[PDB]
């Protein structure tokens, strides 16, 4: 929805209204919880034609609970020159997000790996990103971004970092995408006094393939990270960051033309060298759902995780399954 | 305010400001308190028409106070279908609203009985609501609806509840509104742990009349409650619900042509057989009141408490007389 | 961004989009911190034509922090009738912003004598302004405001007052402006109890001249406080206010032709009679900066912090200096 075009400015405004219901045993052990998630969404893009070859923009999105969860989400601004390419500053995705983002496609659950404020992977707070497509304008399809994490020193370790560099290529070739992306950066003082996790640099990578075409979607990541995944003790009430985490998500999903959209997905993240613990998964489930879109606005779903978290997991993770129902509108 | 109006979908902003100002003496002890109490609204309404007989909609509201309160008050998505009737969920009104709202006019006070989160009566997280009108287009004027109320476990009580139905009635002829509805649900084990109440089971119910036309609105509701209206004890700091309530709420009012709209109402509330007490008033007061329409968009008004609770009040509920003076733009 | 205009009520929405970091040494003993300071804006401004002479009107706007931080900035709602004045009632700014708003121009710092929730000098909630401008429609140039503070109780001394009046004349000729704007208000019990400063009444004034022509803006601004300017002394963790401040801020920029803003600066604070302290300064610092203005949307900004303050500062106030980069998309 335009609210504004004269002067080659043009203003977006845009929002979601969802509601939305998990259901799980009783719901303190399960996947996802139990009971009323629903929430609403309102930001705004803009896109101002400065001259011939840049290009000037910023981006606003909030998130509103309608259940404590109300958060910006995006907020950053930037210039595109020509064929230079783009850079932007801000509250802006980790350029590890590049990679992760390709499974990021399930009804309600799924990018399990792409934690807020964990540096890389998420949505993260003052991240400068310099982004490159088509390599200059002459290789259609090769993309390559890099970026420069900024030192956030906060309250609790969880969501701090320290100075940080990070990088992406991807190529997109007759209906696939592949992507890499590397970040690292420092650990702050408070992190490395956590009781969980031990190093001065944190580190994440991943891969991805995706294929984006015929109604079909499927897409594969693998990543690791090295003392990044905020992880807790539920038995000990202990907190920090696994020291090395594997992960691995596949997602594969067809849309029927008359608007029903089924999925399945599998995600597997494992820890080693816990302190105390030793080996123990984070996160290892199947999902099976659906979504019916009524059309560009409307639509409705169900979001099933069969969890295959044992209930004798070792760091206390939830061992039961959720299923989200869900009917949205949006514009 | 529409935005947006393109393959019938349509988007409208709304929004409001309202700088508003209590009076009482000295107010801890008033009806209403004492100081600045300015606010803003924004919210959008969406409408999507998916086919010949099938809608979809989605409708958000916040509230910024201007002085904590800051609110999501609708936040809803559903599907409507042509005489088979509406379905929807989210953040909601009760179904037990569709009764207390007759007398829920007055210019800044009033509909005391309709508590937010508080089951049925008020604005609430996590229902889902049945609505037909006209009865299967069959008999105009002759509404019901069914609901859904989704288990709430939250810290408090008081924001609190468990599984629960409901239903409304209504019939609107030559200018009258009659309604009555009734609601249940299952208390919290953590309700049930408080001091005040007692019972697994919560209920509300309440009836109507209304009359809307010719400038005049006259508007009657009575109401009990079992074990759900939260009431604090002041002078022991006690929470919970009390046992029982019967709660009257009268409004007449008149709209002058050039834009004056005195006001009168009455409201009274009575707690029976809380733990300690007895039987104690909630609320008890007169209202005189007046606004002022200088169009669509803007208004002022004044609106006098006159408080009959005693100073002598057993809950140390407020005894004090509060006007308030508000201004008003919309849009 | 206009989104209505019908029945001659418009309504404008309006927001920006700020990428913010701070650079500083390590930065607690620093002006203006360390790390990334990034935000959104998002408001309406609405006018209704009631009549020929009388015009209603309503304005909010919200700061959303993307880094605590999420405020109200404006909420009000008044009436203007045509050569008797306007007058309004809300969060607003108070009167003696009219004076100090003159130096609060730099990119990102300055207006540092510009405190929220402080009587009269800046964002307060409950204010009832009075303002006519050229004076009855008689002499060009010369306005003038009074305004009714309403007592404002709340858990804090630092944001909470008393009743209050105060009042403002502006001078406006030839590109030149001259402004003398003056406050009164009683202390609430709970400031008098505070520690730091003494006194039942609150007082704060400010004069200014500003120069706004030929791509040019001059300003200078002397003001004085009496018990009303709160500080902090970070060594013995003591709050409440300063008992006299006397306060001058001297702004110089120029704007070239092809977008480039230089701007000079120097901010000067001094409480006296402190009590344990005596003499102390708050704020002593020389600012250069620089906006670049891509056009009426875009704009990227540096803004250095020469900061004067000693080290030995006897508040513990920051003597480090703090330089600002951001990037700004509005519309
Ligand atoms: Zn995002
Ligand atoms: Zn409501
Ligand atoms: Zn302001």
């Given at each position: 929805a335009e609210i504004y075009n004269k002067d080659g400015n043009k203003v977006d405004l845009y929002g979601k209204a969802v509601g939305l219901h998990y259901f799980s045993k009783?719901?303190?052990?399960?996947?996802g919880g139990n009971g009323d998630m629903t929430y609403a969404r309102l930001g705004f893009k803009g896109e101002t034609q400065i001259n011939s070859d840049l290009t000037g923009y910023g981006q606003w999105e909030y998130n509103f609970q309608?259940?404590?969860?109300?958060?910006?989400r995006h907020a950053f601004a930037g210039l595109k020159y020509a064929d230079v390419g783009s850079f932007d500053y801000g509250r802006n995705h980790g350029v590890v997000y590049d990679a992760l983002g390709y499974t990021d496609m399930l009804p309600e659950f799924g990018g399990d790996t792409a934690y807020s404020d964990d540096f890389f992977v998420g949505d993260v707070g003052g991240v400068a990103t310099y982004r490159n497509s088509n390599f200059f304008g002459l290789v259609d399809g090769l993309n390559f971004a890099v970026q420069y994490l900024g030192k956030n020193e906060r309250d609790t370790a969880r969501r701090s970092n320290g100075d940080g560099v990070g990088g992406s290529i991807s190529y997109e070739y007759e209906g696939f995408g592949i992507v890499g992306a590397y970040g690292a950066a420092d650990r702050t003082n408070l992190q490395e006094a956590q009781p969980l996790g031990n190093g001065k640099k944190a580190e994440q990578w991943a891969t991805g393939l995706k294929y984006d075409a015929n109604n079909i979607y499927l897409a594969a990541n693998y990543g690791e990270t090295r003392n990044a995944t905020p992880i807790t003790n539920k038995f000990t009430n202990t907190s920090g960051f696994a020291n090395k985490t594997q992960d691995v998500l596949l997602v594969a999903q067809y849309q029927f033309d008359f608007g029903l959209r089924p999925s399945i997905a599998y995600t597997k993240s494992k820890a080693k060298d816990?302190?105390?613990?030793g080996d123990v998964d984070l996160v290892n489930y199947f999902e099976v759902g659906a979504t019916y879109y009524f059309n560009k606005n409307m639509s409705t779903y169900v979001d099933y995780i069969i969890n295959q978290?044992?209930?004798?997991?070792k760091l206390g993770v939830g061992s039961d399954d959720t299923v989200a129902v869900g009917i949205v509108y949006q514009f």
């Open positions: 009783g719901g303190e052990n399960s996947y309608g259940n404590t969860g109300n958060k910006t816990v302190e105390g613990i978290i044992d209930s004798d997991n």
